[PDB]
Amino acid sequence: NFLIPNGTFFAVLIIFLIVLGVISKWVVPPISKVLAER
Amino acid sequence: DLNVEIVAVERELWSGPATFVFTRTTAGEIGILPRHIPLVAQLVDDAMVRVEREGEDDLRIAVDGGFLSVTEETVRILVENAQFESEIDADAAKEDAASDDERTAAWGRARLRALGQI
Amino acid sequence: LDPNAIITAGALIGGGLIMGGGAIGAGIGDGIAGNALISGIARQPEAQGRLFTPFFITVGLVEAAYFINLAFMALFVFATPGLQ
Amino acid sequence: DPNAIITAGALIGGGLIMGGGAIGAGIGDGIAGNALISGIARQPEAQGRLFTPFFITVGLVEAAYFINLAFMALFVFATPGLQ
Amino acid sequence: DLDPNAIITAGALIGGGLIMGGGAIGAGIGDGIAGNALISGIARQPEAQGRLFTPFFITVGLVEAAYFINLAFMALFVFATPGLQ
Amino acid sequence: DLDPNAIITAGALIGGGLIMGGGAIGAGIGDGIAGNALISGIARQPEAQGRLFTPFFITVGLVEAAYFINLAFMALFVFATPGLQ
Amino acid sequence: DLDPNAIITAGALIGGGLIMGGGAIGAGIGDGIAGNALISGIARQPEAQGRLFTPFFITVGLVEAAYFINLAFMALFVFATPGLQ
Amino acid sequence: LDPNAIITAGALIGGGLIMGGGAIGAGIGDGIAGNALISGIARQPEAQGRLFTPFFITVGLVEAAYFINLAFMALFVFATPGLQ
Amino acid sequence: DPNAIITAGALIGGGLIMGGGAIGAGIGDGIAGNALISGIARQPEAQGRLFTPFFITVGLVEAAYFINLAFMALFVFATPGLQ
Amino acid sequence: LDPNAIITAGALIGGGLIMGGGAIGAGIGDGIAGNALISGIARQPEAQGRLFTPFFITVGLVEAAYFINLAFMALFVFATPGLQ
Amino acid sequence: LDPNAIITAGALIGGGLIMGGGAIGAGIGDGIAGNALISGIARQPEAQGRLFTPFFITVGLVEAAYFINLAFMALFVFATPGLQ
Amino acid sequence: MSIFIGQLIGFAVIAFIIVKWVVPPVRTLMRNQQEAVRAALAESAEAAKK
Amino acid sequence: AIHVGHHTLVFELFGMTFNGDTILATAVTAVIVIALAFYLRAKVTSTGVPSGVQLFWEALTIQMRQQIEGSIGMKIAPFVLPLSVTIFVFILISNWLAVLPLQYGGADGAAAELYKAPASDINFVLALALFVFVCYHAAGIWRRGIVGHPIKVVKGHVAFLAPINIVEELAKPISLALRLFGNIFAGGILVALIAMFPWYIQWFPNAVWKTFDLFVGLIQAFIFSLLTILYFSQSMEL
Fold it and tell me: Contact at 8 Å (CB) between C6 and D9?
């Protein structure tokens, strides 16, 4: 019965969320800037 | 029967009734019979035509610029140039066959195919 | 229970499967062949006879199997093999 | 009770008989009709002739389905081996 | 020990489920394919639609009508099961 | 006691599962081919975007009507099991 | 003693298994055919990437709706078996 | 119930499945092969003689399976493995 | 032991679900591959343009199949009503 | 009821399903590959040779699954797992 | 009626269903992809080397499903869940 | 234990396949992109100088 | 014993239960992606030879930008661009670390893995799917609002078939979620089964399966990302 939704559902989200922030600042914006510069 | 009217650019090459027509379209070999559905077709660069007529040996024609159109009444082959078999010379056709010139190679191959040597 | 009843039920279900599969296959294959024939007739009416003969062989390849399955009806429903 | 089991198996078999017959008839009809419709669309007046083989095609497939109907007389009305 | 009618009706309903499953598969496939044909025809000939419905119905007819055949047997296989005790 | 009600209910539920399996297959395939035709017509004949929806809607209606008939008769088999003793 | 609960549950989940089998077959086939049409249209029309989506996704929605109705009915059959006892 | 009774009932059912699968496959595969043949004939009648040779082969592959499939059914219904 | 009966039925149901999903995935993938191959044979330049919609369609059909895969767990390992 | 009897019956039903599905798959794949081959031949008679080596691959893979199913006959009816 | 025997019989029935469906899907998809490949090579002889690039991807999915089912088949025959 | 050894051998095969038949083309593509971008940079610089 | 599932090192806090193994896998994946982000940040280059990590990131961004612009111009919904990427790579890493040889026995024939793909867990897939669900629903609200977005979605492309449209809307996230679960759980179960064989028999099937799993994971990640952008575009029009 492991397929029942678990509190882990919430926890993982936060992880993902914080990761997004990095890709929102230090991954995608620099790449867009360098591509536009090229 | 169906009327084949082979019309070359510089001159109406031939016209007459016949029973069956065989041609090499881009999609593939095509046979045309009296009441064939109307259509339009390219003929391959190395195309060829074979007309089977009533009481006469089938005529084999090499064609460059072959461009077929079947109507409700007659079939017309608009052609840049065409050669009947009884006028082509094998040595010239083979000499110019498979040349680096795509047009020359295609025309020579069509000539050889009309001759039947393939 | 009486084993003959179980064997009869099993044979009934087996024959049902046999003929039903045969029927599905025959119907679908005949539809495909008829589509081919209809398209060909639309394409070139003068090939009528030339078109009729190949189609029949196709039908022969299909119907026969169906009939073969139908044949096994006798070997299943009536001549119940293994009946004790 | 042998009758119970025999009748059960017979009804399951007959239901499958009709299911398969219906599948075959439906598919055959669908593809044959699609061929006919495409032919008509390409040539509106060809109907006069195209209906001829189609009636055969349909008659060649639906008959099988109708043949299957016969086994209803053999699977729910007169079950072989009934006890 | 179990009553014959119970198992007989269970088998009858299983058979009816088979009948409808097959009939629905056939009807759906036939209707979809005949449709596809008609839609393609009108797409390549928008004007011809006025006549193009004449054969399509016939096709679907012999499909859809065929479906009713199976439908009837539901009663036979549910309402009045042959061999019911 | 083998509970004939239980046996007949299980048979009826299996029958209904067959109803829905066949209906789902038929409707899915019919919709898939009807789509295929619609997309092909739109790609080949974009201007008929507002016109092809008539017979496509018709074919979808036929297939979904068969599907809903299956739904209704499955509900009849399962929710109100016929033949219960 | 053959528990009626167990027989009922086994029949219910068999029925649901057929639900899902039919639904998966229908959905997969419909999506495949619609995708074939979409790819053929894309090849024929290079720039119709966003143009061919509307009918394609209409039909995808139809097939998926059938499949997910089957999903819901299977869930009902298994988790809350009708006439359970 | 007699072990042979259950064994033979299962054998009948299995052989019915064998026939169903074989009939489906053979029938509609041969149908599509015949469709290809008929379309080719319609598009260009003179290739008839030259196009049977591949078609035959296809049918041989479609029939073979079914035929060999049929063989197994016979065993199931005449030489049932594990017939206690 | 009713547990054995329910387990056997659940296994059969899960197997049927897997079979249905297998047909779904196989046919969908084959159809998508056929479409992509035909398009590519008709033009090499836009290989990625064809790859994209092919990938979406493969994703859709595989989703249809893997719904059944996922319900394998409910049907074999965690069987509702197992008691 | 003999447990061995039920086990063998289930194994034999399973093998029936195996072979039915394998026969269907092999037949349809063979038919489709042959349809493609026949169409190609009708479209390009000279291409025959260059069409066999690709088609072969296809049909081989089409036949591939079938043989695996065949193998499992030995596993099911001849070497039934779980036999007691 | 040994519970283990009944559950194992159901397990073999399952395995049969899974493998039948897997073979169906694999055969049909492989045949469809092979027909596409055969046609493509027929239209233009010398792009066959390119044709394998997409075609293979297709089987990489299709064939995979087979093996997936294969794996589950084993899980049913040798590792019957909930054997108890 | 045995499963661990078999899994290690399998992963070794994975690595061998990756290095033999995956690393070469992907490395070539990366180097191609690097050379293309360097060529663009040098072309811009020399255009400005010209 | 197959031992399917049975999360290991599970615990509970504030009444909510959490799986240690899944959280560990998610944390490791996040660490890898953040390390790649820092590598890019410390090796950013606009006037020199770019790094391999730069090549990878720029190709990822370029392709996602291409699909976005094809669907919806960046000027309308720029936020789709980051989201997309932070999904794709995430899933990819989630499905790639599984290749590493972290399989050790459970002392009872139930082979265990120190690392397991988080997508093999309903929690992770549900989290991702519901996150994207709320994301594009909120985007649709923002473009139109709570008054126009509902009438538009319920009407859909054709309003007279509304119930089908509602079924679309509700079932989108379901499939988006458990497609991941199926894709990765199949691989997990298959590798667990292959663990049965001895080493001299288990080496080859595991190798083939993992070789194929690389492609499976890459393809699945790409399709999930592209489908996310597609839903975003379908939620922002007219």
Answer: no
- Out of L4, L6, L17, closest to residue M197 by CB: L6
D6 inside domain: yes
Using CA coordinates, name the residue in chain D closest to C31.
Answer: D28
Residues whose CB is less than 8 angstroms from the CB of residue K30 and which lie 6 or more positions away in sequence, other chains included: I30, J29, J58, J61, J62, J64, J65, K59, K62, K63
Structure tokens at K40: 């493509």
Identify whether D78 is part of a domain: no
L9 vs M: CB within 8 A:
yes
Resolution in A: 2.9
**What are the chain M neighbours of I66 within 8 Å (beta carbons)?**
178-179, 181-183, 186
User: What is the residue range of I37's domain?
Assistant: 2-77
For B56-103, give the secondary structure using H, E and C.
Answer: EEEEEEEEECCEEEECCCEEEEEECEEEEHHHCCHHHHHHCCCCCCHH
The count of domains in chain F is 1
Alpha-carbon Rg for chain F, nearest whole angstrom, is: 19
Contact criterion met (CB below 8 Å) for D32 and E36:
no
In angstroms, the CA F27 to CA G23 distance is 9
Structure tokens at B15: 């016209």
* Contact check, Cβ <8 Å, H23/C58: no
At H10, which CATH number? Answer: 1.20.20.10
Q: How many CB pairs under 8 A join B and H?
A: 16
Out of M71, M158, M171, the one facing G58 most closely (by C-beta) is M158
Residue holding tokens 């459970």? M106
Residue M74, amino acid: M
Of K64, K67, K75, nearest to M2 by CB-CB distance is K75
CA distance J51 to chain H (A): 11
Residue I9's closest CA among C9, M101, B100, G3? G3
Is F85 part of any domain? no
Measured CA to CA, the distance from residue H27 to residue C19 in angstroms comes to: 12
Q: How far apart are CA E13 and CA J73, in angstroms?
A: 33
Can you tell me the distance from the alpha carbon of M172 to that of M135, in angstroms, rounded to the nearest whole number? 13
Q: Which chains have 3 or more CB–CB distances shorter than 8 Å to chain E?
A: D, F
Interchain pair D15, E41: CB under 8 A: no
Q: What is the 3-state secondary structure (H, E, C) of chain J?
A: CCHHHHHHHHHHHHHHHHHHHHHHHHHHHHHHHHHHHHHHHHHCHHHHHHHHHHHHHHHHHHHHHHHHHHHHHHHHHHCCCCCC
Q: Do C46 and B37 touch (CB under 8 A)?
A: no
- The reply to whether residue I67 touches residue M181, judged by beta carbons under 8 angstroms, is no
Quick check: I30 and G32 CB within 8 A?
yes
Size of interface J-K (CB pairs under 8 A): 170
Measured in residues, chain G has a length of 85
Residue H84 resides in a domain: no
For chain C, the DSSP string reads --HHHHHHHHHHHHHHHHHHHHHHHHHHHHHHHHHHHHHHHHH-GGGHHHHHHHHHHHHHHHHHHHHHHHHHHIIIIIS-TT--
Partner-chain residue, chosen from D1, D22, D36, that has the shortest CB–CB distance to E23: D22
